[PDB]
């Protein structure tokens, strides 16, 4: 499914307990996902493939395959894919009740 | 941390919302994790490395790196590591309130 700066594929759609969601995300080639935070949800990310700058709060990380991150609620985050390869991650949302994104 | 047939490393210990837990598991070389089910918890597994037979209910899967599985509550499951390499997975527990394993 296309979302402009990224594509997403839901995993086990409807089979996870209320409050949880899982998906594959691919940040497109050379794309920035700009600064945003979630009001309620937590996000766990497992990096499958590619490389990107991943920003959480004041820190920017060199995200590489095998890395795992946690983005807590009301924590700004962003991604800069500087490569021609998609930046692919396995995403688990927790305390998730629908879109709660604030874009800056 | 050693658990006999597997080793585990908690991830973001204490930072996840109540009801959720994350860890790295490594099923040891050549080891079987025998049939068991959870009363309440759901388990999402991302296979990092190695190969194993993963049983869920009546189905046995050839689990390989990149595969993702969901084990629902009160669903029997088991793993047979036939390789000398550890079977390494990223595990997210949902609807998780403590050890609720029934071993058969
Ligand atoms: Mg986010
Ligand atoms: Mg289990």
Numbering used by the authors:
A (entry chain A), B (entry chain A): 9 to 112
Give sentences copied directly from the paper behind this entry:
To investigate protein HHP adaptation, Elastic Incoherent Neutron Scattering (EINS) and Quasi-Elastic Neutron Scattering (QENS) have been employed to study the dynamics of two orthologous proteins from T. barophilus (Tba) and T. kodakarensis (Tko), which only differ by their optimal growth pressure. X-ray crystallography was performed to obtain the structures of the proteins. Both present very similar features: their structure is dominated by β-sheet contributions with turns and disordered regions connecting them, forming a jelly-roll barrel structure, and both present a dimeric quaternary structure. The active site is located in a pocket inside the barrel and is conserved between the two proteins (His44, His46, Glu51 and His85). The two orthologs differ at 16 positions, and most of the substitutions are located at the protein–water interface and involve mainly polar and charged residues, with the notable exceptions of I35V, located in the hydrophobic core of the protein, and I100V, located at the monomer–monomer interface.
Interestingly, the catalytic metal ion coordinated by these four residues is found to be magnesium in Tba PMI and zinc in Tko PMI; however, the structure’s resolution does not allow for making a definitive assignment, as the Van der Waals radius of both ions is smaller than the resolution. Tba PMI crystals were obtained after two weeks from condition F7 of the Morpheus kit (Molecular Dimensions), containing a 0.12 M monosaccharides mix, 0.1 M buffer system 2 pH 7.5, 30% v/v precipitant mix 3. Tba PMI crystals belong to the I222 space group and contain one molecule in the asymmetric unit, while Tko PMI crystals belong to the P31 space group and contain eight molecules in the asymmetric unit. After model building using Coot and Refine from the Phenix package (Tba PMI) or REFMAC5 (Tko PMI), the final structures exhibited an R(%)/R(%)free of 0.18/0.20 at 1.7 Å (Tba PMI) and 0.23/0.29 at 2.2 Å (Tko PMI). The results show that the mechanisms by which Tba PMI counteracts the effect of HHP are: (i) the prevention of excessive amounts of water from penetrating the solvent-accessible cavities and limiting their destabilization, (ii) the inhibition of protein–water cooperative relaxations, and (iii) the reduction of internal (i.e., inaccessible to the solvent) cavity volume. To this extent, the I35V substitution appears to be key in the stabilization of the hydrophobic core, with the added importance of being close to the ligand pocket, limiting its deformation under extreme conditions. In the dimer-forming region, the I100V substitution optimizes the contact between the two monomers and decreases internal cavity volume, stabilizing Tba PMI’s quaternary structure under extreme conditions and seemingly maintaining optimal functionality.
